[PDB]
Structure formats: structure tokens, C-alpha cells
Amino acid sequence: ELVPLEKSVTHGRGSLLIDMGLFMGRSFRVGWGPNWTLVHNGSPFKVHMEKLSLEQKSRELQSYLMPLEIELKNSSVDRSAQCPHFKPNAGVAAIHDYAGWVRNLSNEAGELEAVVKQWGLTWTLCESLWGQNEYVRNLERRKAFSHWLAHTAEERIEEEVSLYGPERHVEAVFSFLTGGRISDACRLAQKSGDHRLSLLLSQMVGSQEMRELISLQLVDWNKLQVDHYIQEERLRVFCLLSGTPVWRSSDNRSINVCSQLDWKRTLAVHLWYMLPPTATIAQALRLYERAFQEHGEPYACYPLPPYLEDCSISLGDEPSAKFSSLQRDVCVHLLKLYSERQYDLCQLLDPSSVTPDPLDYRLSWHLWMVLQALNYTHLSEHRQGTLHASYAAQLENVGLWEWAIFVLLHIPHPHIREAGVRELLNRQCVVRESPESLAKENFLIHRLCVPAQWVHEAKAIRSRRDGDRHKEALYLLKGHQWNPCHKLVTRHLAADAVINENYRYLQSFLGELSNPEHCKHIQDWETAGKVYLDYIRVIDMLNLIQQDESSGCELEKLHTKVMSLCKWVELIHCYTAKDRLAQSEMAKRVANILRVVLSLQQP
């Protein structure tokens, strides 16, 4: 075993500069390889090697499948250049497509992870704003957002109420009010008797002024030094309907109504109770923001990611110096972008915001696609490329194919994109054709428009490094290679076929390379190619013509050709032993044929 810990003498001589390198040989760093494979060092004691991949909840194939399929169904192909350019369709109700997918998931998502609910929340908020009479439109958006807020808190509110046991107007009523469901809240308030609310459901009208008069009465009571010996937080709840989020009373008590509420509910309360029934979302957002930014107490709660909430950083005497490094949930930034065009898209699109690990990028990528489709492209080319690459890498880590190809193809740079996809193909392509491989190839060719010639070129690279001649040559056939193919066949296949009497194959290959342009470009084409072609053709024609009444013109042609063939057999160059044998065989055969031809002509 390597010595446990000798780090003194050898360290002093390790700082020596005569051969610091030789003294620093003990070192090692072998990093990566294809598909994130990690090589490393460390009963024999030597070196070990283990894989490396994204193992966090590594079993979700179906989801990948569904949204990826939806994306392809919504994308357009532009084959203007050699490398196609896929572009998303501009705002084709993609947000609706995503919500449907989330609902389909919800059928069997009762027993899934927490990331599912995070994503659901994110997408539905995106829908309630940017989903897409100005006043009427704003009011409808407000109603939808209210529905979302109520729905997302519904479960929590129901759990809380069950815990209350005998209800208390101090807490029970607070929870009901912030979570809506006023129709059931009235049933809960029957202990004292309250049906003016039924009278309200009948005519939803003048609520503003009613509540304002209630507030006036309350503030009169407050200034009159009364309304003090009543229940402590009953007064807290009265201040809520009044419209004061923080009340400093005569006893110097800081009555914070906004306390015990998570950031979302705090903003919601500001929208309905504190602000008038006719208001714009932006103003409310800004007010809430200033609320936790102090004035004067910070009565609102900081927008925290759903996973970082547990341990709100201990703001011991210095809260601000930490807030300037803490992230905020995607929803806030979505609202800000919905209002104005001055914000860092990069912060908004950070994997950590939704899921702690920095390796999951599905949501981020789909959100970037939606943002591109909403005419919001402030993102720099560098970051776009980085995102695409990381997503493709995650895909490859699991083991995906054409979808990573499509992600690569959204990069708006022709050469770079093409090279990337080519490299990807070469590394993953398998020479052994399988049902799955064939399916993938068909997909690529019939959906993403790629060539089978490129597929065969990939196969030929593999079958050249360590592969066999047969497969290499087959793949080169359809790969439109002239010089290399020519060389290959002349050296090995040719003589083998001569001695195995298989010329039909040799001839197909050689004639496909004899076409006007091909023959022009192929080097040494004239020499060897012509030689072999002539041999085969001469045999065949001799046989046929002898049987077919020996046509004289064809006989003359054969004579000319055989003379030319003699002229070339002598010039055959020898580099190997097979060349000699083949040469001799050909010479013998041609001499016999020549004799037969002379016999059938002159005599």
C-alpha cells in the first residue's frame, strides 16, 4: 500500500527546485471520458474505477417522453442550409399544452417527488399572467390569479383547520380569511350568527365602502382608548379588515397582522385588504417588496425558494448583506418580467431556484423556449449555448438520442451546430444494426431530416479503427467515397473474388465508380479499375457472343479490348504477394481468351 502519511523530509525535498517534478511524481489526475465516465485511482492495493452520473431520482422516463414529444409537435423545420434549423413556433398556446401535461401527471402524481409540485406551481403561475377593454382584461387576470392563490393554499388551509380543534376567532378566522372560502367561513361563524354575508353573495356590491366604514369605526375605537380589554388577536383581526398591516398601539405594542404568513400570502393580503378593489398588480408587488425592505419595521416576509425556507438565515444584526446573495423563486421574476423589460433573465433561469441540485435542467430549458416564444430574448448567446449543451449532456447521461439532437439544432450557428451533431453521431452510433437503432435512424431521417450517408460515414469511422473490412466497405459504398474505396477493393477484395469466381459483386462496385464524373475524379482509376472491368467484361462477352451467332462487330470490339488488357497486365505494380498471384492468373486467362479469339476470327 502507498505509505499512509510521510510528509516532512520528503516535503522539504519536495520544495526543492532541482527536480521538483521528479519529487512530484507521486501525483495523479486522470479526469473524464465519453458519457461522463470518470477514471480515477484507488488483497492487492492498486487502482479502481467507477462510473459517474446523475443519480438523483434517476427513474422518470415517461415525463421526458411526454413534454419532448409535445415540443416536437409544436416546432418548425427550416432546411435552408446543409444543417437544418429548428425554431419554436411563436406563442402557440404552449403554456396551455404544459398545464394539460401537468394535469395528466396529477392523475398518478400522488405518489411522486416534491419537484413535481414545484414545477406545477411555476407553470400555473406563468399561465395566470403571461398565458394570454383593458380594465376588463386586467380584472380577469386578477380573478385568475386569485383563483390560483386560493387553490395553491387550499390544501394547507384545510390541514390547518383540522388541527385547530375547537375553533378560535383569533386564529381560525385569520386562516379562513387569508385562504378565502368565505362561503364556508360564514357557516363557521354561525356560533355568533351571521347572515349579512348571504345578503352579500346575493348582491356582490359596495363591499369597499362597507369595509371602509367598518375600518372607520375600528380606528375611532382605537383612538378612543377603548377596544383594549377585548381579546388580544381579535383586535389583530379587526386591524386586518381595517387596512393597517402594522399597528403601534398606546401600549407600544407592535401589532403585526402580516406575521405568521409566507411571502405569497403576504402579497395577497396587500392586494385585497390593504389596497382598493381596483388596483394594478405591479403597484402591489412593489409595495410588498418595499415592505420586507424596511422603512418602520420589515413586516413582510422575504421571497424564499420553497426548499430554503426551513432555515431562514439567522439575520443577526445584518440581514441585508445576506439577502444580496440569496435567490428568489422563479415566480417573482416572472411577475417582474410580465410588468417590465428590465431584469436579469439569467437569475430567473437558474436550476437551483426550483431544485437544489445544479444538474436538473428540464424546467429551465422549457421555460427558455416559452420566453423565446414570448418575444423576450435578452439572454446572451453564451448562456443559451451553455444551457443547450448541459441539457443535451443530461440527456446523454441517462441515455437519450434524437431529442438531444433537436436541442443541439436550436443553436442559431450553422457550422457549430453541424459539427456538434456530427460528433455526437460518431460517438453513439452502433455498427450492429438493431431494431432500436433502426428506429432511431428512421426518426432522425424522417423527422429531423438527417442523411443516411452521414450515418454510414459514422459506421465507417468505427469499422476502421477496430472494425472489419467487409462492413467498412459496405458502409463506404453508400458513403460516396472514391479514392479510399478504390484502394481498399483493389488490394484485398479483388484477388479474393478472382480466385472465388465472384465477379457480379466486383463489377457492380467497379461500374458505379466508372461513371463519367466519378472516373474523372478517382485517381489510378484508369489503371486498376479499367484492368478489372475489362477482365470481367471480356469473360462475359466472350461467352455470350460465342453462343449468340458470333456477331462480328462485337468480336472486333472484344479484340480491341483484349489487346488493351494485355498492354495493361504487364504494367501491374506489385507491393504484396497477392498482387503477383492475381497478376499471373489474369495473364494466363487473357492469353487463353486471346488464343480463342484469334482462332474464331482469322481461321
| Nearest C-alpha neighbor of 368 from the set 353, 383, 352, 354 | 383
Q: Min. distance of Cβ 189 from other proteins in angstroms? A: 47
Coil, helix or strand at residue 368: helix
Q: Min. distance of Cβ 469 from other proteins in angstroms? A: 12
In the complex with other proteins, the residue whose CB is nearer, 246 or 379, is 379
Which residues pair with residue 7 across a beta bridge? none
In the complex with other proteins, the residue whose CB is nearer, 393 or 477, is 393
Return left, alpha or beta for 225; rule: phi > 0 is left, psi -120 to 50 is alpha, else beta: left
Phi, psi (5° rounding) for residue 254?
A: -85, 95
In the complex with other proteins, the residue whose CB is nearer, 380 or 508, is 380
In the complex with other proteins, the residue whose CB is nearer, 270 or 530, is 530
Coil, helix or strand at residue 594: helix
Q: Min. distance of Cβ 239 from other proteins in angstroms? A: 34
Please give the DSSP secondary-structure letter assigned to residue 529. I
In the complex with other proteins, the residue whose CB is nearer, 411 or 538, is 411
Ordered DSSP codes for 141-203: HHHHHHHHHHHHHHHHHHHHHHHH-S--TTTHHHHHHHT--HHHHHHHGGGT---TTHHHHHS
Q: Min. distance of Cβ 365 from other proteins in angstroms? A: 12
Coil, helix or strand at residue 32: strand
Q: Min. distance of Cβ 311 from other proteins in angstroms? A: 19
| Nearest C-alpha neighbor of 410 from the set 88, 7, 154, 63 | 88
Q: Min. distance of Cβ 39 from other proteins in angstroms? A: 5
Q: Min. distance of Cβ 200 from other proteins in angstroms? A: 41
Q: Min. distance of Cβ 318 from other proteins in angstroms? A: 21
Contacts of 173 (CB under 8 A, 6+ apart): 185, 188, 189, 237
CA distances from 167 to 156, 233, 260, 480 (A): 16, 14, 18, 83
In the complex with other proteins, the residue whose CB is nearer, 215 or 426, is 426
Q: Min. distance of Cβ 404 from other proteins in angstroms? A: 10
Q: Which three cell numbers stand for residue 41?
A: 485511482
In the complex with other proteins, the residue whose CB is nearer, 238 or 401, is 401
Contacts of 172 (CB under 8 A, 6+ apart): 161, 164, 188
403 exposed, middle or buried (CB, 10 Å; 0-12, 13-18, 19+)?
buried
In the complex with other proteins, the residue whose CB is nearer, 172 or 421, is 421
Residue 266: half-sphere exposure toward Cβ, Cα within 13 Å: 25
Phi, psi (5° rounding) for residue 353?
A: -50, -50
Distance between CA atoms of residues 191 and 186, nearest Å? 10
Distance between CA atoms of residues 69 and 590, nearest Å? 63
Q: Min. distance of Cβ 351 from other proteins in angstroms? A: 7
In the complex with other proteins, the residue whose CB is nearer, 121 or 348, is 348
In the complex with other proteins, the residue whose CB is nearer, 129 or 476, is 476
Signed CA dihedral, 74, 75, 76, 79: sign only: negative
Entry field: residues in the chain: 603
Q: Min. distance of Cβ 213 from other proteins in angstroms? A: 36
In the complex with other proteins, the residue whose CB is nearer, 26 or 196, is 26
Contacts of 494 (CB under 8 A, 6+ apart): 506, 528, 532, 582
Please give the DSSP secondary-structure letter assigned to residue 38. B
Q: Answer for the pair 564, 520: CB distance below 8 angstroms, yes or no.
A: no
Q: Which three cell numbers stand for residue 530?
A: 479499367
In the complex with other proteins, the residue whose CB is nearer, 235 or 408, is 408
Q: Min. distance of Cβ 34 from other proteins in angstroms? A: 5
